[PDB]
Amino acid sequence: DKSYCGFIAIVGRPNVGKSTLLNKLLGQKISITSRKAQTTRHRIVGIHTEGAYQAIYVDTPGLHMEEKRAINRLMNKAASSSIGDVELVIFVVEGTRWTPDDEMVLNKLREGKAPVILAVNKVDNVQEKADLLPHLQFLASQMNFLDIVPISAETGLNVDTIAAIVRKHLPEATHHFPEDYITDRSQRFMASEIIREKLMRFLGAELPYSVTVEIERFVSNERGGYDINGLILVEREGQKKMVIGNKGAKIKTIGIEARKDMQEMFEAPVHLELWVKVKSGWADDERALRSLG
Numbered sequence: 001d002k003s004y005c006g007f008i009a010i011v012g013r014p015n016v017g018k019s020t021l022l023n024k025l026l027g028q029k030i031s032i033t034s035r036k037a038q039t040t041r042h043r044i045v046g047i048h049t050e051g052a053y054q055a056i057y058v059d060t061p062g063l064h065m066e067e068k069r070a071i072n073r074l075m076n077k078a079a080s081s082s083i084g085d086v087e088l089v090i091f092v093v094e095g096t097r098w099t100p101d102d103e104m105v106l107n108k109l110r111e112g113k114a115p116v117i118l119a120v121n122k123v124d125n126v127q128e129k130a131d132l133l134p135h136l137q138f139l140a141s142q143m144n145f146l147d148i149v150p151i152s153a154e155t156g157l158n159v160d161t162i163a164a165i166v167r168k169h170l171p172e173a174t175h176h177f178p179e180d181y182i183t184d185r186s187q188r189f190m191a192s193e194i195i196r197e198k199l200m201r202f203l204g205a206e207l208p209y210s211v212t213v214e215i216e217r218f219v220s221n222e223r224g225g226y227d228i229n230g231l232i233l234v235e236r237e238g239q240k241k242m243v244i245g246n247k248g249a250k251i252k253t254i255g256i257e258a259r260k261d262m263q264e265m266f267e268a269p270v271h272l273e274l275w276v277k278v279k280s281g282w283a284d285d286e287r288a289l290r291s292l293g
């Protein structure tokens with residue numbers, strides 16, 4: 001009748017789909033990505049809190065004192081307040097690709113005490129579904145995995161399977177964090193949050209699943225103001241038009257409101273541009289439209 005809270009690492013070389021899977025695990029209808037991907041002192045990438053379960057996702061396999069201290073700062077807690085250890089490692093790879101980078105990551109998991117799960121991502125993207133079996137057996141001989149589960153972070157295929165395992169490894173404990181805590185204080189992130197919020201405000205009942213927001217460009221001008229490029233991404237074409245809305249008024253208003261809330265929070269000028277793109281490729285009219293004024 002009490003609670004569970006713990007640290008779950010998500011690891012794997014760049015591009016295997018770590019952030020994509022993280023987002024499917026957080027389960028927000030609108031998600032945020034960042035093609036900049038930078039390293040923080042506390043290594044928290046996201047927090048999933050549902051009922052009595054709080055999963056704290058990090059991007060290092062093990063937490064070292066410097067980092068527990070950074071995590072305590074983030075929460076504004078006395079630096080000697082206790083912090084547990086990574087309880088489960090999600091090792092992520094893509095389809096049947098296997099490189100020395102993949103191995104460098106593996107090397108640091110045996111170095112640890114925590115059980116490792118092997119999430120074979122981009123499974124949807126495998127050419128000959130045959131190649132899989134032999135590869136998986138080769139993968140399995142690399143170390144004792146608690147489990148091996150092929151997934152598509154994009155589709156959601158098997159991600160619930162990862163979730164359920166994660167829940168199982170949360171030690172009994174009080175939650176560290178408040179339910180909706182901001183772990184990324186960067187202005188760049190704050191811009192995303194505002195767009196996501198305006199999307200949720202104005203789309204209402206029509207707003208689909210799997211929308212993601214992303215800030216392609218964040219700069220300060222000479223005028224001590226700001227220039228921001230926002231990119232809103234949707235699964236299918238029909239959705240792209242609900243976002244733009246009848247006569248382009250929907251995306252027009254969203255932009256106006258977001259640029260407003262943005263100027264207020266940044267106490268500075270803001271020029272905001274917003275693009276709606278369908279994940280699977282731009283388009284002919286759109287690409288040619290992109291490179292303009």
Ligand SMILES: Nc1nc2c(ncn2[C@@H]2O[C@H](COP(=O)(O)OP(=O)(O)O)[C@@H](O)[C@H]2O)c(=O)[nH]1
Nearest residue numbers: 014015016017018019020122124125152153154
């Ligand atoms: N086809 C396919 N692409 C994926 C899948 N998961 C992620 N991707 C793509 O992989 C690219 C990078 O994923 P990302 O999470 O940002 O990489 P990472 O955080 O550096 O590991 C993105 O364009 C994703 O859309 C998947 O399950 N299938």
